[PDB]
């Protein structure tokens, strides 16, 4: 199935020119720009791996695009996303986050039902690929 975390995940995968235009947006919003990657795609996995540090005070999308493609080469069978952080007072947080690479195939999640008191159930989801070590995923 398609994982729909991300601002634009209901659109087709973004081309490099679309990606360029989103970097331009972030630049004009004056965001820090980070590249993060993971192959544990759980919705509560808040901390993907960082590909380098976020880029601050950026003025040209090309160095951002170069690092996206370097991450795509090093980590092609990972989810890769671009995050825009705002330092604006009373926001101080991500304001955009979108997928720039998906594995070729997504098996999805297992649903676990642990039966509890009366009719209540305690739920877990476990991404199928996480039943394997990191280097065997996707």
């Amino acid at each position: 199935m398609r994982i729909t975390q991300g601002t634009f995940s209901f659109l087709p995968d973004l081309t490099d020119e679309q990606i360029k235009k989103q970097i331009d947006y972030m630049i004009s919003k004056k965001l820090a720009i980070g590249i993060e990657y993971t192959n544990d795609i759980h919705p509560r996995n808040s901390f993907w791996e960082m590909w380098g540090l976020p880029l601050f005070e950026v003025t040209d999308p090309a160095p951002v695009l170069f690092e996206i493609n370097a991450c795509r080469k090093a980590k092609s069978n990972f989810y890769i996303k671009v995050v825009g952080f705002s330092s604006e007072r009373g926001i101080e947080s991500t304001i955009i986050s979108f997928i720039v690479n998906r594995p070729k195939h997504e098996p999805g999640f297992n649903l676990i039902r642990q039966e509890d008191k009366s009719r209540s159930i305690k739920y877990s989801i476990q991404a199928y690929e996480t039943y394997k070590p990191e280097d065997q995923r996707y």
């Binding site: 601002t7 209901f10 659109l11 919705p43 989801i125």
Partner: protein
């Protein structure tokens, strides 16, 4: 006499600690605007039944509200804007009941005043600082959902009522799986003979977890905890919590104290708290009496709710877009700047209280998305009715069309396309890769 009793003071200087109110006053046929304002001021403070020795045992002046400014309503010879100041020490800290009791209660005027509407309030920084503000707030709610840079999507379950727990969960599951971020209980659905609340909550949680496992997203369903007594609301809130719900809802009709009680509970238990407030309550399109919705927005942001319905500009609700923009600012901005066209009469610092999320609900569809993004911005929950459930291809499909249209419009906004002018072509380029959207667009363009 009211103007001669202290209540009218044209020379009064407002302090940073004063609570200020702006009333739209319509004076009795042949009564003076100054006396009218004075009456309103003198009624919402120290009621002068003439001669009272016991006043001289107190710092009397302090407790008297001051009418300090009167302007003629521009475009209405018979109506006036009266600005009234209240000392901060009159008000119980942290209490909306006390604030509302103080201002709109005492405020009479039988002999001088024909009609009165409260238009706006300037709550001073030090007063606002006594309230919790939103339990969660926009920034934290987005961090919990891992959802950034776009409006959120929701809809109410259709039909409102009558589905069993199991068939109710079915709708919730289909809609969530199809694309929506949230589904909601109707404000009418509490606990009734056709369906009691525990089975609803139990089947809903199954739907919500199924939908998260099918999408890899955080999903939510606003479980309505509205009930007749506090203990009953707490019981319903406690099951939502226990079962791991991300969000609950309450109806504004529970009233201020139950709202504050619930806002504190949602803060203490990591729960998003959506407030339902009727967009077309009989108490709606008034120009004469009552209070304007911007005042409700201020008080509810102070009380501490996380979502409130704020209006659309388009669709079925026929709002003045600039007045609406004014409701959004009240909810979202850290500082409000006077702007008479938006109906904001005072500058106001929000004292770092968290942001409330506006909700746009009411006869909206996927073909208006450019207008919706343009008028309402990206911090909003857009709620679509049979705009989802009544897609000829299914609930999932209806959800997908709305979600694609939204992402496509936000992508064009970020690319700096003139998405307001080129919005229809943007939707049509999106529908090209999306049959559900193609089907949605054809339906609401052929007639409706």
């Amino acid at each position: 006499p009211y103007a001669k009793m202290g209540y009218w003071n044209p020379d009064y200087q407002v302090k940073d600690t004063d609570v200020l109110a702006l009333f739209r006053v319509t004076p009795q046929p042949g009564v003076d605007p100054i006396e009218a304002a004075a009456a309103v001021a003198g009624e919402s403070s120290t009621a002068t039944w003439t001669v009272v020795w016991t006043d001289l045992l107190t710092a009397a002046d302090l407790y008297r509200a001051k009418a300090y400014k009167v302007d003629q309503v521009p475009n209405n010879p018979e109506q006036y804007f009266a600005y009234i100041a209240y000392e901060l020490d009159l008000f119980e800290e942290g209490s909306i009941a006390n604030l509302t009791a103080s201002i709109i209660g005492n405020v009479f005027g039988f002999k001088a005043v024909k009609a009165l509407r409260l238009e706006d309030m300037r709550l001073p920084f030090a007063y606002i600082k006594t309230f919790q503000g939103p339990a969660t707030g926009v920034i934290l709610e987005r961090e919990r959902l891992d959802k950034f840079g776009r409006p959120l999507l929701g809809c109410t379950t259709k039909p409102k009522l009558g589905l069993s727990g199991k068939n109710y969960g079915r709708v919730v599951y289909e809609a969530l799986k199809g694309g929506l971020d949230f589904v909601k209980d109707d404000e009418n659905i509490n606990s009734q003979p056709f369906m009691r609340w525990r089975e609803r909550y139990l089947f809903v949680m199954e739907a919500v977890n199924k939908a998260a496992a099918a999408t890899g997203e955080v999903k939510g369903h606003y479980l309505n905890v509205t009930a007749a007594t506090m203990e009953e609301m707490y019981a319903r809130a406690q099951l939502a919590k226990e079962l791991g719900s991300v969000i609950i809802m309450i109806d504004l009709v529970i009233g201020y104290t139950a709202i504050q009680t619930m806002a504190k509970w949602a803060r203490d238990n990591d729960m998003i708290l959506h407030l339902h407030r009727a967009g077309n309550s009989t108490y709606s399109r008034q120009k004469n009496h009552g209070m304007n919705f911007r005042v409700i927005c201020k008080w509810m942001r102070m009380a501490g709710v996380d979502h409130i319905h704020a209006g659309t500009v388009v669709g079925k609700l026929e709002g003045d877009p600039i007045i609406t923009r004014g409701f959004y600012k009240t909810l979202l901005l850290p500082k409000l700047e006077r702007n008479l066209q938006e109906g904001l009469f005072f500058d106001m610092d929000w004292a770092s209280l968290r942001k409330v999320m506006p909700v746009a609900s009411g006869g909206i569809h996927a073909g208006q998305m450019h207008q919706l993004i343009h008028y309402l911005g990206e911090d909003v929950v857009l709620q679509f009715g049979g705009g989802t459930i009544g897609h000829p291809d299914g609930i999932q499909s209806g959800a997908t069309a709305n979600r694609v249209a939204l992402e496509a419009m936000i992508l064009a906004r970020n690319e700096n396309r003139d998405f307001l002018t080129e919005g229809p072509e943007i939707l049509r380029e999106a529908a090209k890769n999306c049959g559900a959207l193609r089907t949605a667009l054809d339906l609401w363009k052929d007639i409706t």
